[PDB]
Design a protein around this ligand. Structure first.
Ligand SMILES: [Zn+2]
Ligand SMILES: [Zn+2]
Lengths: 117, 48, 50
DNA sequence: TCAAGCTCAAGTACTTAAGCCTGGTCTATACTAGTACT
DNA sequence: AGTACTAGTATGAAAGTACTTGAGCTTGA
């Protein structure tokens, strides 16, 4: 489905707003401070995830691997480069529903690969 | 089920406050819905 | 302690007896559990008297 | 269809927060008017 | 006569309940 996103006008750089073309039945975006119009490519407008199953692998930063206060195991090798050190931690996120799942971040410089088991 | 007890619950009964911290309602079942957990979960869905 | 340690030692279980003596951290957590006793005794008396 | 009356909900304002006891320290400042000295 | 000093006089981390006001809805003309 997609979580969609904003679009900005190209003249006054304001927020475009979705509106309906009544003649051609084509979704348009129009700034309200000028006459600028643009055709909607995505065709979805407002999308809301209530169940909100969230992918934490997107939020996790690779720099986390430098923290002394996080644990690490040589049990789980890196999936990409096959490095033994992995520094694992939990959600660290409020409103996570119920997750004790560990997320893994590969140590060694610049790898930064982030997986979940 | 966490319910209030002790002195905080005593101010509620004494003051007769309109909104208690922990209002609760115990509900007993008549027929076969009392013995069977499945028949009970059915009524459980109707009260919630 | 290390981040996200839910083990018994990190979260306050004291495995020592007053006779063998508490280890440094168990001394601090034991002090955190006793403060909750002192506070209650100071607070409840003024409510139970009103 | 419009106006008036009644009811309900929301917002604002007012009253209370343990029992006894022992010690201590500290208590206006500013402005104006009147009097004295140079 | 003017200026300065002294003395006196004048002024964040409460909670809950009840009442009043405003708005909305229904009924009557
Ligand atoms: Zn524009
Ligand atoms: Zn790696």
């Amino acid at each position: 489905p997609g979580i969609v996103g904003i679009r900005f006008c190209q003249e006054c750089n304001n927020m475009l707003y979705p509106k309906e073309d009544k003649e051609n039945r084509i979704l348009l975006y129009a700034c309200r401070n000028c006459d600028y119009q643009q055709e909607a490519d995505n065709s979805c407008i407002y999308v809301n995830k209530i169940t909100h199953e969230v992918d934490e692998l997107t939020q996790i930063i690779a720099d986390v691997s430098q923290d002394p206060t996080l644990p690490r195991t040589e049990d789980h090798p890196c999936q990409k480069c096959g490095h033994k050190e992995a520094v694992f931690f939990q959600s660290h996120s409020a409103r996570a529903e119920d997750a004790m799942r560990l997320y893994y971040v590969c140590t060694a410089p610049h790898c930064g690969h982030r997986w979940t088991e | 089920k966490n319910v209030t007890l002790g002195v905080p619950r005593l101010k509620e009964l004494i003051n007769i406050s309109k909104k208690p911290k922990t209002p609760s309602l115990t509900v007993f079942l008549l027929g076969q819905s009392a013995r069977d957990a499945e028949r009970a979960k059915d009524i459980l869905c109707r009260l919630e | 302690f290390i981040k996200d340690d839910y083990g018994p030692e990190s979260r306050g279980f004291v495995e020592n007896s007053y006779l063998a003596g508490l280890t440094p951290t168990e001394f601090f957590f034991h002090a955190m559990g006793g403060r909750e006793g002192l506070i209650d005794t100071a607070v409840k008396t003024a409510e139970t008297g009103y």
